[PDB]
A paper describes a structure:
Host proteases, TMPRSS2 and CTSL/CTSB cleave the SARS-CoV-2 spike to play a crucial role in the two alternative pathways of viral entry and are characterized as promising pharmacological targets. The entry of SARS-CoV-2 depends on two distinctive pathways, cell surface entry and endosomal entry, where the transmembrane serine protease, TMPRSS2, and endosomal cysteine proteases cathepsin L/B (CTSL/CTSB) cleave the viral spike protein. The crystal structures of TMPRSS2 and CTSL/CTSB in complex with the potent inhibitors were determined to reveal their specific mode of interaction.
As a result, two inhibitors, K777 and E64d were identified with an IC50 value of 5.43 and 88.85 nM for CTSL, and 174.30 and 244.26 nM for CTSB. In the structure of CTSL in complex with K777, this compound was found in the active site cleft. The density for K777 is connected to Cys25, evidence of a covalent bond. The sulfonyl group is located in the oxyanion hole formed by the side chains of Gln19, Trp189, and His163 and the main chain of Cys25, whose function is to stabilize the carbonyl oxygen of the substrate at the tetrahedral intermediate stage of proteolysis. In addition, K777 forms three hydrogen bonds with the backbone amides of Gly68 and Asp162. The phenyl sulfone, phenethyl, benzyl and N-methyl piperazine moieties of K777 insert into the S1'-S3 subsites, forming hydrophobic interactions which further stabilize the inhibitor. In the structure of CTSB in complex with K777, a comparable interaction pattern was also observed by the corresponding conserved residues except for the loss of one hydrogen bond in the oxyanion hole and the formation of one extra hydrogen bond with the main chain of Gly198 mediated by an ordered water molecule.
Residue numbers in the entry: 0 to 121, 124 to 254
Write the structure that this text describes.
């Protein structure tokens, strides 16, 4: 019994991380952002908004190591969630936010848009197992662990049920160049060359002007796309959007 539309921001209005858009900066850390963003949302969902924390992309990006991939050169969503269950992740906010244990260290930049920040350019930061000044508790006690991590089947209904019951998920899809230009509506690949793989947070679904879609958060800042979000065609494994969905359930802090 699933609704025709669902938006995690409306279901869990006291979980501000669900509404928050991040910026990977000049670093291919999308695999880590999709993970920590979904984990942040699920911790809040799991505690009915009694715990709301930004889980540190910095901690995952820099401390997972080779099991997750190659840092700013790209990585793997499934192993990000596994690292969360084995070693946990500390808190950390946006660049220069002074939020949490290890806030993001890569400065924001413009991702295929004209803006006020430097344009994004072509190096993974070192793993620092120590929190930033003024933050407590210590890095060891700030860790949040997952109970498990799992793949969701390549099935529209299965993915919808997973989001409906357990919160936002991480997914992956093929980026073609016409995606770069997205502003509004439901994206479908119509033109442009293949560019590579991208990992994102899926937080809902709906139908817009007859087209079924997934509601997705990009990590290219809020001046990209639809205030940082996009919608992509749902139900056809379009660009592989339904083929690499991963999630997991938090441990209680
Ligand atoms: C995030 C995607 S992005 O930066 O938004 C982007 C970049 C280019 C084209 C489209 C989108 C990163 C970028 C990785 C990258 C860095 C530098 C040059 C080229 C690419 N992408 C990833 O982390 C992806 C995630 C992924 C995993 C599995 C399936 C689909 C997507 N992984 C990735 O690109 N990797 C895997 C690890 N390997 C060592 C490097 C390539």
């Amino acid at each position: 019994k699933l609704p025709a539309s669902f938006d995690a921001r409306e279901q869990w209005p006291q979980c501000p991380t669900i509404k928050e858009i991040r910026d990977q900066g000049s670093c291919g850390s999308c695999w880590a952002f999709g993970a920590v963003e979904a984990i942040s949302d699920r911790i809040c969902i799991h505690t009915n908004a009694h715990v709301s924390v930004e889980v540190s992309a910095e901690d995952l990006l820099t401390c997972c190591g080779s099991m997750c991939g190659d840092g700013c050169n790209g990585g793997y969503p499934a192993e990000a969630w596994n690292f969360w269950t084995r070693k946990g992740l500390v808190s950390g906010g946006l660049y220069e936010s002074h939020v949490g244990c290890r806030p993001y260290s890569i400065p924001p930049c413009e991702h295929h848009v004209n803006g006020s920040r430097p344009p994004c350019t072509g190096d993974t930061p070192k793993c620092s197992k120590i929190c930033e000044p003024g933050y407590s508790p210590t890095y060891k006690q700030d860790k949040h662990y997952g109970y498990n991590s799992y793949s969701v089947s390549n099935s529209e209904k299965d993915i919808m049920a997973e989001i409906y019951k357990n919160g936002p998920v991480e997914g992956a899809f093929s980026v073609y160049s016409d995606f770069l230009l997205y502003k509004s509506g439901v994206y479908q690949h119509v033109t442009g060359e293949m560019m590579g793989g991208h990992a994102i947070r899926i937080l809902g679904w709906g139908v817009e002007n007859g087209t079924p879609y997934w509601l997705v958060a990009n990590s290219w800042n809020t001046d990209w796309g639809d205030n940082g979000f996009f919608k992509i065609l749902r139900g056809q494994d379009h660009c592989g959007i339904e083929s690499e969905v991963v999630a997991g359930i938090p441990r209680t802090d």
